[PDB]
Design an enzyme around this catalytic site. Structure first.
Site, mmCIF file in Angstrom:
data_model
loop_
_atom_site.group_PDB
_atom_site.id
_atom_site.type_symbol
_atom_site.label_atom_id
_atom_site.label_comp_id
_atom_site.label_asym_id
_atom_site.label_seq_id
_atom_site.Cartn_x
_atom_site.Cartn_y
_atom_site.Cartn_z
ATOM 1 N N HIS A 200 -25.767 6.846 5.966
ATOM 2 C CA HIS A 200 -25.151 7.449 6.937
ATOM 3 C C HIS A 200 -24.164 8.401 6.504
ATOM 4 O O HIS A 200 -23.044 8.096 6.093
ATOM 5 C CB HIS A 200 -24.847 6.655 8.171
ATOM 6 C CG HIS A 200 -24.603 7.223 9.386
ATOM 7 N ND1 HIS A 200 -25.568 7.631 10.195
ATOM 8 C CD2 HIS A 200 -23.533 7.973 10.054
ATOM 9 C CE1 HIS A 200 -24.942 8.166 11.507
ATOM 10 N NE2 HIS A 200 -23.817 8.496 11.253
ATOM 11 N N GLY A 201 -24.633 9.901 6.690
ATOM 12 C CA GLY A 201 -23.470 10.784 6.789
ATOM 13 C C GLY A 201 -23.023 11.056 7.967
ATOM 14 O O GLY A 201 -23.666 11.452 8.973
ATOM 15 N N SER A 202 -21.772 11.797 8.168
ATOM 16 C CA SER A 202 -21.025 12.308 9.001
ATOM 17 C C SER A 202 -20.036 13.257 8.897
ATOM 18 O O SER A 202 -19.634 13.205 7.746
ATOM 19 C CB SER A 202 -20.567 11.332 10.229
ATOM 20 O OG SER A 202 -20.736 11.712 11.678
ATOM 21 N N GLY A 209 -12.769 7.452 13.776
ATOM 22 C CA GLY A 209 -13.716 6.584 14.820
ATOM 23 C C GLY A 209 -14.700 5.736 14.331
ATOM 24 O O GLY A 209 -15.158 4.680 15.084
ATOM 25 N N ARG A 216 -21.468 3.690 17.305
ATOM 26 C CA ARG A 216 -21.813 3.416 18.575
ATOM 27 C C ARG A 216 -23.283 4.162 19.086
ATOM 28 O O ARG A 216 -23.722 4.641 18.282
ATOM 29 C CB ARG A 216 -20.904 3.822 19.813
ATOM 30 C CG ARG A 216 -19.525 3.059 19.883
ATOM 31 C CD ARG A 216 -18.334 3.804 19.447
ATOM 32 N NE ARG A 216 -18.232 3.971 17.998
ATOM 33 C CZ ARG A 216 -17.381 4.985 17.535
ATOM 34 N NH1 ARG A 216 -16.747 5.845 18.441
ATOM 35 N NH2 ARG A 216 -17.445 5.500 16.059
ATOM 36 N N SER A 242 -28.736 12.435 4.407
ATOM 37 C CA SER A 242 -27.780 11.940 5.067
ATOM 38 C C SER A 242 -26.544 13.016 4.441
ATOM 39 O O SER A 242 -25.479 13.172 5.721
ATOM 40 C CB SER A 242 -27.339 10.572 5.026
ATOM 41 O OG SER A 242 -27.992 9.533 5.731
ATOM 42 N N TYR A 245 -25.741 15.894 6.922
ATOM 43 C CA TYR A 245 -24.860 15.709 8.102
ATOM 44 C C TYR A 245 -23.391 15.736 7.723
ATOM 45 O O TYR A 245 -22.649 15.607 8.714
ATOM 46 C CB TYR A 245 -25.403 14.347 8.917
ATOM 47 C CG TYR A 245 -26.621 14.589 9.686
ATOM 48 C CD1 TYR A 245 -27.929 14.647 9.153
ATOM 49 C CD2 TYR A 245 -26.457 14.879 11.056
ATOM 50 C CE1 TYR A 245 -28.997 14.962 9.866
ATOM 51 C CE2 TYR A 245 -27.611 15.166 11.538
ATOM 52 C CZ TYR A 245 -28.807 15.213 11.301
ATOM 53 O OH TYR A 245 -29.878 15.383 11.948
ATOM 54 N N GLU A 329 -37.171 8.348 8.515
ATOM 55 C CA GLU A 329 -35.914 8.376 9.630
ATOM 56 C C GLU A 329 -35.959 7.060 10.282
ATOM 57 O O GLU A 329 -36.909 6.664 10.901
ATOM 58 C CB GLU A 329 -36.286 9.295 10.481
ATOM 59 C CG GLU A 329 -36.366 10.844 10.050
ATOM 60 C CD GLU A 329 -35.603 11.899 11.082
ATOM 61 O OE1 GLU A 329 -34.754 11.577 11.514
ATOM 62 O OE2 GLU A 329 -36.021 13.033 10.944
HETATM 63 C C1 ERV Z 1 -31.680 12.547 14.003
HETATM 64 C C2 ERV Z 1 -30.854 12.248 12.672
HETATM 65 C C3 ERV Z 1 -29.396 12.219 12.938
HETATM 66 N N1 ERV Z 1 -28.550 11.715 12.101
HETATM 67 C C4 ERV Z 1 -28.974 11.543 10.785
HETATM 68 C C5 ERV Z 1 -28.196 10.981 9.678
HETATM 69 C C6 ERV Z 1 -27.031 10.879 9.376
HETATM 70 N N2 ERV Z 1 -26.076 11.171 10.524
HETATM 71 O O1 ERV Z 1 -26.644 10.670 8.253
HETATM 72 C C7 ERV Z 1 -29.386 10.968 8.695
HETATM 73 N N3 ERV Z 1 -30.494 11.221 9.365
HETATM 74 N N4 ERV Z 1 -30.161 11.644 10.451
HETATM 75 C C8 ERV Z 1 -31.445 11.774 11.483
#
Ligand code: ERV
Length: 352
Positions: A200-202, A209, A216, A242, A245, A329
């Site tokens: 998970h990347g953000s 958070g 969440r 990821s 993102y 996904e």
């Molecule tokens: C629709 C969707 C949303 N977010 C992500 C991430 C992430 N947030 O790292 C990876 N695939 N992905 C796919």
């Protein structure tokens, strides 16, 4: 608050995720008007007010009305979420991937409310500022040694599962952390099978958070058509997917990557995207988007009971007759299916 008590490497990470300065820079990069309504005056109600007005925007697109119906809806949205488009008249929100653009914005903003609240709680007592933030995160960050077998797996996880289609940048792992958010271990669905270590990347503003409140689900007022596979917590098996993102730029080329143990269980496998995928789960514990490329089963090492899909991401033979996603996904719709484990400080090497 004299000498800090934290590990020097943790101190570096704390300052990075807790920088309210770049938080404004990224919100301004997303065209959010920090002047009309600064991040310091951001109520959760405003964000819930933003979500509702985005739903009034999906209600227009579904009904197909592009007159005032949409023009009034979008403006009403922009009033609660002040934007900055300068010369041009603000744009009309018309697509699923334009809706997702703002739900991305409202999420990042909500993760900033959490953040600034944590930095404002620092008073000025007997603890160093950085140590006070860490304690408030209620999540542990053990730095791992570069020679750890954990680190050997991660680097080989990082680069060997870098998709060939995200070639415009290479990734380089500056440090690695052991994550344990308090209470997460105490509720992880140990029962569920298919236990995997997923990406998970953000964006940088969201990590306070994320390390404090976990990951969440979407609020109920969010537009349902906006989320690709529904209101869940999205993961990927490819590091680069990821890492996209993270939204690192050629100037801010550093990012954070969240490897977490995801209890997937029996998967509902889909080829075309469908937001209403949560309704059609029926006893299955997750939705899987089926892509063409993924790590081959012949490289699945295990780390602390979780399957880590290494090796080169070979083809999967998947092909949709009727769009075929390139990459897989994963979607879990309850936080108890996710336990955070590893956080990765990653430098991006873009190529011109
Ligand atoms: C629709 C969707 C949303 N977010 C992500 C991430 C992430 N947030 O790292 C990876 N695939 N992905 C796919």
């Amino acid at each position: 608050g004299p000498e800090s008590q934290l590990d020097l490497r943790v101190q570096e990470l704390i300052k990075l995720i807790c920088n309210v300065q770049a938080m404004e820079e990224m919100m301004m990069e997303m065209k959010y008007n920090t002047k009309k309504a600064p991040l310091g005056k951001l109520t959760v109600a405003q964000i819930k007010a933003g979500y509702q007005s985005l739903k009034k925007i999906e209600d227009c697109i579904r009904a197909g009305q592009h007159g005032r119906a949409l023009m009034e809806a979008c403006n009403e949205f922009y009033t609660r979420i002040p934007h900055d488009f300068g010369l041009r008249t603000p744009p009309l929100i018309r697509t699923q991937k334009e809706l997702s653009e703002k739900i991305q914005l409202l999420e990042a903003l909500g993760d900033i409310e959490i953040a600034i609240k944590l930095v404002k709680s620092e008073r000025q007592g007997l603890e160093h500022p950085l140590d006070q933030h860490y304690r408030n995160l209620h999540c542990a960050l053990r730095p791992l040694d570069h020679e750890s077998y954990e680190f050997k797996v991660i680097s080989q996880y990082l680069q060997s599962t870098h998709a060939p289609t995200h070639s415009d940048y290479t990734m380089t792992l500056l440090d690695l952390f052991e994550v344990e958010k308090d209470g997460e271990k105490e509720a992880f669905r140990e029962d569920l099978h298919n236990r995997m270590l997923l990406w998970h990347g953000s964006r940088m503003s969201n990590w306070v958070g994320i390390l404090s409140h976990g990951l969440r689900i979407a609020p109920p007022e969010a537009p349902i058509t906006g989320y690709m596979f529904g209101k869940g917590i999205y993961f990927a098996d490819m590091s680069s997917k990821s890492a996209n993102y993270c939204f690192a730029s050629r100037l801010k080329n550093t990012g954070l990557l969240l490897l977490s143990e995801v209890a997937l269980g029996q998967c509902n496998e889909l080829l075309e995207a469908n937001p209403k995928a949560e309704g059609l789960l029926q006893g299955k514990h997750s939705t899987k988007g089926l892509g063409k490329m993924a790590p081959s089963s012949a490289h699945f090492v295990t780390l602390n009971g979780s399957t880590v899909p290494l090796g080169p991401a070979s083809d999967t033979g998947i092909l949709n007759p009727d769009y075929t996603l390139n990459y897989n996904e994963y979607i879990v719709y309850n936080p108890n299916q996710v336990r955070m484990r590893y956080l990765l400080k990653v430098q991006f090497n873009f190529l011109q």
